[PDB]
Design a protein around this ligand. Structure first.
Ligand SMILES: Nc1c[nH]c(=O)[nH]c1=O
Ligand SMILES: [Zn+2]
Ligand SMILES: [Zn+2]
Ligand SMILES: [Zn+2]
Ligand SMILES: [Zn+2]
Lengths: 478, 478
C-alpha cells in the first residue's frame, strides 16, 4: 500500500486537494485526511500536484530500422520514461513485408517482456493479403490490439499505398480498431531524396528539404479522406506542419473523428538545427517528419489550444552518434529518430503551463487522458478515480531540471534539447501503485511491467454506426 | 471583310461604344463611326454587346471512350459551339496505355480536320516511359502543344499514379508546359464502385455515391501539392466540389499558381437528377465528377466571384440513349459525359450576369480571356484589339432561348438543361472574321477551322524561375 498525502489532485478537468491511496496496483481511495492502513508507506505531496502518469502512445524501443537496431531497449526506455513521469507506453509491432503479423507480434512481446512499466502495441500494416486481414482480426479478438499503424512514406520498404490503406481501414472498421497513419507522401520524399543526392547535397541540411511540409499535408489530407469515405476514425501521429494541422481542423470542422498527435520537438525546435556546423549535432535532429520553420511551431501550439491536436508523444527512437554516422555521406541513410520519453512531460509543462498557453487540466488531457480515451483505456488509465490503475506522477512546480545527454536516463548520446532548463519536474513517479522514481532515485526492475490490452470499439464507433445507418443507400424503383 | 457597327464592346475589364472592322481573319480597326471599306459586309450591333468569342478548353469530340465513340464529332461539335457563341475549343489527345503520344496526336489531327472553327489539343499522359517523356518534348517543340492532361481516376485504364504524376509534372516544368488534372482519387472510386455493385445498387443513382465530393478534394489536394513541390503551375479541370475549391483557394492563398475550371452543369444542377424514376433520364446526367448536393453549387459560384475559379468549359462528351444504355445493369459501364458546348455561354450569362453574381467583364474573363491567358493564347484570342484573331460573339441581352435536345445543334439526344429558358443569347458569332451564326442560320463548313498552336512558357514560368533561383538548396561546409 502507498498513500500520497496533502497534494492537489489535478485531472483533465478540475483541481482539488485530496489524498490518494493505492494498493494492489489500483487506486483504492481518494479524499481529505484519509486513514492510513497499517504498514502503508506514505509520500508527502505538500505543495505539489498529483496527476495521472503520462502515457506515451508513440515509442520504438529497440526497433530494427534503416540498417540497424535502436540503442534504447524496452527496459531502459520504460525506465527512463518513469524518471520523467511517464508510466505507460504504446509501441509499434512493425512486421516486414510479406511477414506474418502474429509472428511479428509474439517476437515483439518477447522483446518487450523486459519492460519496467505498463506497455501495449499498435500493429503496423506493412503489406496486404487475406491473411493480414485474418490476422488483424485475431490480434484484436485475442491479443488486446485495437489500433493499426500505416506508413505512407518509406517507399520501397514499409510504405502502404492507397490500395492497402483502403483495404486495411475497411478492416479496422469491421474490427472496431482505430487506423493510425504516419502521413508523408512517399513518392515525393523518394523523388526529392534522389534529386538532392544527385545534386550532391548529402548533408543533414538536405533532410528537411527532402520532405517539406506540403508532403505531410498531402498525406494527411489523403488519410483523412479515405477515413471519411470508409467511415472510420483516424489518428495521425506526430503532426509537424501547419498544412497537416489545417487538414485535421478542416475535417473536424466537418465533425469527422480525427485525432492529431504532436511531439515536444515539433513544438519547440525549428529546421535551423539541420544546418548546424557540426555534422553529428545536425544528424542528431534527423527524424521524420523533420523539424520545421518557426511558423509551424506557432500553428501547432494553437492546435493544442484549439482542440485540433489531441495527444503528446515522443516517437522515441534512439540512435547513437555511430549509428547516425551510418549516413555521413548520404542524409537518406541516417537512421531517423530522436529521444524524448523522459523529457516530454517536463518540456510541455515548462513551455505550455509555465508560459500558460495550456492550463494544468489541458496538460493532463494532453499527456494521458486524451490518449487513454482515443485508444479505449479510459478510465483504467489517464484517470484519478477509485478502481483506476495506480499510475501517477507527483509534480513539483518549482523544481528545476536541465536536460542533457550526459545525465538523462535514456540510453543515447544525444538530447535534442541539450542544455535546456525546465521549471516544473516530476519529483515522484508511481507505476502500478509502486514508487519507481523518487527525488533522483530510479527503482525500475526488468520485467515489472504488464502488457496492456485495449478493447475494440471505442465509443466513437457507436456514433459512426448510427451515422452509417442513416446513410444506407436506397435504390430508385423503376 | 466584316464591320460590326454600333455595338457596345465588352471586354474582360471594360465596356465602350465602338465599331470593329475585321479582315483577313483578324481585327483590323476599332473606333467610333469607322469608315466602311468598299465591298465590306456590315453587321448592325445596335443595342447589343460585342465580346470575344468563347473559348471552351475542355471538349471530347468523337472520343472513343467507355466502349464506344461519342455521338458528337469534330464538325458537329464545333458548329454547335458557334451557334452558342463559342469560337474555339481545346480538345484532348488521349493515347491508350503503351500507345505512342505522337501516333495518337496525328490520329486526332485527322479526326479534327473537319472542325468548323479553330481548335487545339491538350495531350493526356496515360502511361510513362522514356519514350513518353521524349514525345512530350516533341509535341511542344513541333506540334504547338503546351499543356498535358493527367487522369487521377480510371483505375486499370488511363490512371496516373503519383510516380507518373511526379515524372510528368517534372517534364512539364522542363518544357514550359502547363500540367492539367482530372482530380478524383481512383482507388476510392474503384473501391466504392465495386462495393455498391456488390450490394445490388446498379442504377444511375449509385453513380454519385461512388465518387463523393471528398474523393475530388483529395485528388485536388494531391495534384496541387505535387505541383507545389515540383515548382509548376497547375490547372484543375471541371471542379465540382467545395472540398476541391477549398484546396485551390488554400494553395492560391499561399501564393501558388493554381487555376480552376468549372462547368455550367456543376454550377446549376444538383445530384437529385440521378434519382429520376426514368432510367434513361437519370443516365443522361452521368459524368465524372458527378453533380453534387446544392451547397456545392453555392461554393462554386463563390469561387467564380472570389477569383478562385478561373475558366468555364463544358467537358463536351456526347452519348445518345442507346450508348448510355450500355450500363443499364451496371452504372459503372454508363459512358460518362454530357453535352454543353452550345449552351455554356448563354447558361452563364443568364445565371451569372442577369442575377448580378457576375459583371459582364467577369463573364468575358470566364468564357474566353482567362483560358487564353492560362494556355498562352492571349492576346491572339480572348481579346478585342487590332491584330487579334477575329473571333467575336454579338450578344442580345434581351433575346431569349429555350434549351432543348429537340432543337439544339449538338448531335446528341439529351440536354441536361432540357426546357430551361435563358435571357441573353448570341445573335451572331464571328469566327476567323467570318459570320458563321446569324440569328438562327448556322453557316459552319467542315474543314474551315485551323489547328491552333500554343507556345510554351506562359508568363507564370518567368515568376516561377525567379522563385526557384531564390530557393536553390545550399550545402553547409564542414
Ligand atoms: N473524358 C471525360 C468525359 N466525361 C467525363 O465525365 N469524364 C471524363 O474524364
Ligand atoms: Zn512515424
Ligand atoms: Zn514513429
Ligand atoms: Zn474529366
Ligand atoms: Zn473530360
Amino acid at each position: 500500500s502507498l498513500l500520497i498525502r496533502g497534494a492537489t489532485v489535478v485531472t483533465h478537468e478540475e483541481s482539488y486537494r485530496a489524498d490518494v491511496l493505492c494498493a494492489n496496483g489500483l487506486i483504492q481511495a481518494i479524499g481529505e485526511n484519509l486513514e492510513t492502513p497499517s504498514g502503508c508507506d506514505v509520500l508527502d505531496g505538500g505543495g505539489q500536484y498529483l496527476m495521472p502518469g503520462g502515457i506515451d502512445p508513440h515509442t520504438h524501443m529497440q526497433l530494427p530500422f534503416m540498417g540497424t537496431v535502436a540503442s534504447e531497449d524496452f527496459f531502459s526506455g520504460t525506465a527512463a520514461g518513469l524518471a520523467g513521469g511517464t508510466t505507460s507506453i504504446i509501441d509499434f509491432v512493425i512486421p516486414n513485408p510479406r511477414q506474418s503479423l502474429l509472428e511479428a507480434f509474439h517476437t515483439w512481446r518477447g522483446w518487450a517482456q523486459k519492460s519496467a512499466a505498463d506497455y501495449g502495441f499498435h500493429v503496423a500494416i506493412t503489406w496486404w493479403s487475406d491473411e493480414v486481414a485474418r490476422e488483424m482480426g485475431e490480434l484484436v479478438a485475442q491479443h488486446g490490439v485495437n489500433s493499426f499503424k500505416h506508413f505512407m512514406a518509406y517507399k520501397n520498404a514499409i510504405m502502404a499505398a492507397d490500395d492497402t490503406l483502403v483495404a486495411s481501414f475497411e478492416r479496422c472498421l469491421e474490427l472496431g480498431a482505430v487506423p493510425t497513419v504516419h502521413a508523408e507522401n512517399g513518392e515525393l520524399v523518394f523523388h526529392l531524396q534522389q534529386k538532392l543526392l544527385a545534386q550532391g547535397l548529402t548533408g543533414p541540411e538536405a533532410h528537411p528539404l527532402s520532405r517539406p511540409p506540403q508532403v505531410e499535408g498531402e498525406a494527411a489530407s489523403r488519410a483523412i479522406r479515405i477515413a471519411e469515405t470508409l467511415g472510420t476514425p483516424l489518428y495521425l501521429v506526430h503532426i509537424s506542419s501547419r498544412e497537416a494541422l489545417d487538414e485535421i481542423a478542416y475535417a473536424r470542422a466537418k465533425g469527422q473523428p480525427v485525432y492529431g498527435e504532436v511531439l515536444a520537438g515539433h513544438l519547440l525546435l525549428d529546421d535551423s538545427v539541420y544546418r548546424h556546423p557540426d555534422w553529428a549535432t545536425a544528424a542528431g535532429y534527423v527524424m521524420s517528419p523533420p523539424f520545421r520553420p518557426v511558423e509551424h511551431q506557432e500553428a501547432l501550439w494553437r492546435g493544442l489550444q484549439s482542440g485540433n491536436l489531441h495527444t503528446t508523444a515522443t516517437d522515441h527512437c534512439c540512435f547513437c552518434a555511430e549509428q547516425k554516422a551510418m549516413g555521413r555521406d548520404d542524409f537518406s541513410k541516417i537512421p531517423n529518430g530522436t529521444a524524448g520519453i523522459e523529457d516530454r512531460m517536463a518540456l510541455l509543462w515548462d513551455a505550455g503551463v509555465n508560459s500558460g498557453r495550456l492550463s494544468m487540466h489541458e496538460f493532463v488531457a494532453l499527456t494521458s487522458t486524451n490518449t487513454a480515451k482515443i485508444f479505449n483505456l479510459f478510465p483504467r488509465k489517464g484517470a484519478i478515480r477509485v478502481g483506476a490503475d495506480a499510475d501517477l506522477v507527483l509534480w513539483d512546480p518549482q523544481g528545476s531540471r536541465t536536460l542533457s545527454a550526459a545525465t538523462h536516463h535514456q540510453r543515447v548520446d544525444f538530447n535534442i534539447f541539450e542544455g535546456r532548463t525546465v521549471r516544473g519536474i516530476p519529483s515522484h513517479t508511481i507505476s502500478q501503485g509502486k514508487l519507481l522514481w523518487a527525488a533522483g532515485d530510479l527503482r525500475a526492475e526488468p520485467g515489472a511491467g504488464r502488457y496492456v490490452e485495449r478493447p475494440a470499439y471505442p465509443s466513437v464507433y457507436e456514433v459512426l454506426g448510427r451515422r452509417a445507418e442513416r446513410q444506407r443507400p436506397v435504390a430508385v424503383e423503376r
